[PDB]
Design a protein around this ligand. Structure first.
Ligand SMILES: Nc1ncnc2c1ncn2[C@@H]1O[C@H](COP(=O)(O)OP(=O)(O)OP(=O)(O)O)[C@@H](O)[C@H]1O
Ligand SMILES: [Mg+2]
Lengths: 396, 41, 102
């Protein structure tokens, strides 16, 4: 189905800004959340499954978990991924979904036919399962999702059916924190209301925090009101068109298979050892080989995004940045800020040095505004934090 | 992740099955004596 | 949350529909916002202590032994306005960390 498509997508790949173009093209109706969109792009393009011999299966699926307080467009992200991805099935932790997580065998209500209704984990064997309300799942649903994520298989022993059928889906889950408000004081594991084994099987953990930020609120309100105005019934790169993005995904998943021959084992091992040392230097969740494997998966995903067929050092650095950002956000504030300061080298990769300065300015002005709102910024503070040299570019 | 004198998986399965079906061992007298003394200690 | 903005939009549309106007107006949106704001109610718990707590925490974070620091706090906040020092010490004693959010 891709002839002139395949003609043009190669040129788009050589465009050399295709990664940013895709990351901006994901969820055109959702404002902000660049990190979430980047993670979703990596998940959409997936990794490279492998199995040394036939005895050490390792998944090539990048699982994502958006844990966030209400009003953060997690449902919209899941719905957009449903719309874009092929073989994308939307299931909910409640009982109000067309499909369910657990497989059963029964006579169909309509077909009146004795059918083995496999779960929403199996109906996306080579696709994406969008599990909304991931925190409100039954015991059987939790066990089914555990089995699928850890084994990629679903075992039925129901009537006379003793079978084990494969469900190799990529799980994109949406969840709310305990109490309906994420608290960085506590860690992600004790904020999310999920079991640690369940959490571990997720490559990306997006903490979608909501804060009262003047500029963000104004821009989001502008976006929402504009969408309403233009959809009223009486009627920095350019995003790719959605159909072109779909075909790009098809080609990237079908043909290019990135290989890991050229990756700095020394650099990555040093990073892993340093992360472990810093992990037990404070009272935080340690990093594990699981994280380096997830970083490998994300590096393969970036290589697939750029059709490289080989993971390049920039791909490895971007995968490391995603893995770090996630692992850091999973920590409590006390250790989160410490690790961010210690490993700012990795976190700052592929940052033009304007976003960092803008965030520093935003935090300074937020401190000032919270001071003022209760009681009733200088160039020096900004330059000091920059030292922690060029502000003309940021000002202009 | 990059690469992806022993026994392969299927051969190991078959070897385990054959050993289980064929051989059921028993402890010897001296082996039992040593095991008893070590267990007492 | 943005759901409140969506509800405000719906309420303004409802006001316009009530008045049979084909386009919402400043008055309609103002009434919708007023209704939403009045509907949301202030929690009452058994109240100005939080202001002192957050200001002193902000000062500490900006700074980032008890003998020196307690007096530092007892002097700093009184730089803008004799009976309130004991109240300040009382709230400090009630408070008496790495994991804390303002
Ligand atoms: N970043 C955003 N940009 C644009 N619209 C947004 C954004 N965040 C939320 N919205 C809109 O605000 C409303 C809230 O979004 P939505 O219903 O998806 O919430 P949610 O994250 O699924 O919430 P919950 O977890 O409570 O169910 C919707 O109208 C959504 O379109
Ligand atoms: Mg939702």
């Amino acid at each position: 189905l891709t002839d002139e498509d395949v003609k043009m997508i190669t040129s788009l790949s050589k465009d050399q800004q295709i990664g940013e173009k895709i990351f901006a093209s994901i969820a055109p109706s959702i404002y902000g959340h660049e990190d979430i969109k980047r993670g979703l792009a990596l998940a959409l393009f997936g990794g490279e499954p492998k199995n040394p011999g036939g005895k050490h299966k390792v998944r090539g699926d990048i699982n994502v978990l958006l844990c966030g307080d209400p009003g953060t467009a997690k449902s919209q992200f899941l719905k957009y991924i449903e719309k874009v991805s092929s073989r994308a099935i939307f299931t909910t932790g409640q009982g109000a979904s067309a499909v369910g997580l657990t497989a059963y065998v029964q006579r169909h209500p309509v077909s009146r036919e004795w059918t083995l209704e496999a779960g929403a984990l199996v109906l996306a064997d080579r696709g994406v399962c969008l599990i909304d309300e991931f925190d409100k799942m039954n015991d059987q649903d939790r066990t089914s999702i555990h089995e699928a994520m850890e084994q990629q298989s679903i075992s039925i022993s129901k009537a006379g059916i003793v079978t084990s059928l494969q469900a190799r889906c990529t799980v994109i889950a949406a969840a709310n924190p305990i109490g309906g408000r994420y608290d960085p004081s506590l860690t992600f594991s004790e904020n999310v209301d999920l079991t640690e084994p369940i959490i571990s099987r997720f490559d990306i953990l997006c903490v979608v925090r909501d804060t009262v930020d003047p500029v963000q609120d104004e821009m989001l309100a502008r976006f929402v009101v504009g969408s309403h105005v233009r959809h009223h019934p009486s009627n920095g790169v350019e995003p790719l068109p959605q159909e072109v993005l779909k075909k790009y995904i098809i080609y990237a998943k079908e043909r290019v298979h990135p290989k890991l021959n050229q990756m700095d084992q020394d650099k990555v091992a040093k990073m892993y050892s340093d992360l472990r040392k810093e992990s037990m230097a404070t009272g935080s969740i340690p990093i594990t080989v699981r994280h380096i494997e997830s970083m490998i998966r994300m590096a393969e995903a970036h290589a697939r995004i750029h059709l490289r067929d080989y993971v390049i050092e920039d791909d490895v650095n971007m995968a490391i940045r995603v893995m770090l950002e996630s692992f850091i956000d999973t920590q409590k504030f006390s250790v989160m800020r410490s690790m961010r300061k210690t490993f700012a080298r990795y976190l700052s990769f592929r940052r033009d040095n304007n976003e960092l300065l803008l965030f520093i300015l935003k935090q300074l002005v937020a401190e000032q505004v919270t001071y003022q709102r209760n009681r009733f910024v200088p160039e020096k503070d900004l330059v000091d934090k920059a030292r922690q040299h060029n502000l003309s570019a940021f000002y202009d | 992740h990059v690469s992806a004198g022993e026994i392969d998986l299927a051969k190991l399965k078959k070897f385990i099955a054959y050993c289980r079906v064929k051989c059921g061992p028993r402890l010897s007298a001296e082996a039992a004596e040593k095991l008893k003394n070590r267990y007492i200690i | 949350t943005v759901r409140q903005l969506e509800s405000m939009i719906r309420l303004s549309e409802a006001m316009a529909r009530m008045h049979c106007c084909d386009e919402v107006q400043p008055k309609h949106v103002k009434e919708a916002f007023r209704l939403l704001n009045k509907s949301i109610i202030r929690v009452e718990t058994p109240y100005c202590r939080i202001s002192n707590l957050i200001v002193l925490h902000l000062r500490k974070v900006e700074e980032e032994k008890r003998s020196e620091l307690v007096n530092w706090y007892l002097k700093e906040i009184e730089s803008e306005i004799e009976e309130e020092l004991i109240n300040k010490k009382r709230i400090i004693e009630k408070v008496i960390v790495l994991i804390e959010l303002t």
